[PDB]
Every structure is written in C-alpha cells, then in structure tokens.
Homo-oligomer: A and B are copies of this chain.
Amino acid sequence: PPRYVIGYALAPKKQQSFIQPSLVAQAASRGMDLVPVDASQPLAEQGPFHLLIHKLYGDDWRAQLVAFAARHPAVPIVDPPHAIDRLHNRISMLQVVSELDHAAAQDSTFGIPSQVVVYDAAALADFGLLAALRFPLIAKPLVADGTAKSHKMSLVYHREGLGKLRPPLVLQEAVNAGGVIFKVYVVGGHVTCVKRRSLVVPPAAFINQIAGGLRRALGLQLFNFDMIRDVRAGDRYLVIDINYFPGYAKMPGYETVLTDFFWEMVHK
C-alpha cells in the first residue's frame, strides 16, 4: 500500500497548536506523513508532496506557491492563495457571503451586517455618520489576515474609546445581537460548532446550508465563521467574521476530522 506526503507550511505558533503528536500519529497510522516545509529553501527544491497545506502570508510565499502550482497541477493546495486573499481585508471578507443569496427561505434567514470603514484619524474625529451610531460597536482592523498581533475583533462602549483605536478599521453595530456569538468551524463538507458569550442554538440544517454556501462562494476547504441571532425577529442570523484556517486545535477530536479530510483530499 503506497504512502502520502502532506507538506505543511505554518508559522511556529500555529505549528505548535495545529501539528500535535495525536494528529501526526493518527495520520501516520493511516499512511499519511505530515512533513514540515523548509522556510529556508524554495518549495520547488523541497520533496515530492501529495497535498500541500499552509497558512503563510508574503509576496515571497505567494510566488513559490504559484511556481509549485504551475509545475504540479495534480497536487491540491489547501488553500489556493487567490481564495485566501479575499478574506484578508475585513470589509472584502463578507463580500463573498452575499454571493449565495439563493440559499434557503425555510423558517430561518441569514444576512450580512452593514459596515463602516474609517481609513484616517482625521475622519475618526470629523465623520458626521460616526455620531448617529448605536453602541456597543464591534471594531476590527480593516486588513487583518491573522499575522500582526492586534488582528482580532474588539468592543467599544464609550465614543472616547473609539478615538483611541488605530485606523484603518471596520465597524458594525452589536445592538441587535442579543449579546451572543456562535463560532462555526468548517473542514471541507464537515461542520462543527461552538458557543461563546460575547462582551437558543440555530437549526443544524441551517448552519449546514450556510457552511455549504460559504464553502462554494469562498472556494476554501478550511475556515470558520462567527454568526449572531438578530434578536428583533427571534429567528434570523448574521455572518460577522470569516477567519481562514482557524484554531481547530481548540475543538476536541479535530485530529480525526482533519485526518479524515487529508484522506479525502489525497484520493481527490
């Protein structure tokens, strides 16, 4: 029976969290060898791979990945750098949601929250529209990715606290949220979901339809989304983040899901 190299290109802190003995063992036992990509050596120079997974950001890496991709058409990349680029900018991140409008009328509806972009300290002070905003506000830096430390979301109650943030940033209103957040982890066509008190769980078929959509639209095997209930109508949900290749190490039995996923991908 043949054997399958899974190359992996991840920042140290991600490797420490993601690549765990339990993942490495389970994969090995099923015939798949997780193998670190040398960061000090062209990806093209490096050994044959049956699958490449990565979560690195650079014009350098983009370049090597495209050389590889154009040299090795048959080898899956998880995920293709094009598709990852769309979620880097917080306001261009929800662009792709709107895309599967033709989802389900059922007894649940899903939408994207309207957002406000402030590029300079000047506008933070002078922009009239900021004064007609309801607090608290969810504030995210406009171009995240998950590199630079402060590229996670935060909560602004005082309008003072808003003028202490560093632009460029995106804002959305948190007032119809009920104060709850549901983090949904997606691996290919699998869905796993976790509750988290911010600052009455959605139907499983709805969460599955949306993940189904996001996956189609995003062209991404590895993401999560945050949604909230619109507490006005009782039965409506909003997609508020989409973070690529999230911390699966945090959901339990991820080893099994991800090995099951690696397996699917190397018989593709």
Contact = CB atoms under 8 A, between A and B. Distances in A.
Interface of A: 59, 62, 66-67, 69-71, 82, 85, 89, 91-92, 94-95, 97-98, 111-120, 122-123, 127-134, 142-143, 167-168, 173
Say how many copies of this protein the assembly contains.
2
B114 A115 contact: no
Contacts of A128: 132, 134, 173
Contact of A120 (B111, B118, B123, B143): B111
B94 A92 contact: no
Contacts of A82: 59, 62, 85
Contact of A66 (B69, B89, B142): B69
A95 B142 contact: yes
A118 B172 CA distance: 11
15 contacts: A62-B82, A89-B95, A91-B92, A91-B117, A94-B117, A95-B119, A95-B142, A98-B119, A98-B120, A114-B116, A114-B118, A114-B127, A115-B117, A117-B117, A129-B173
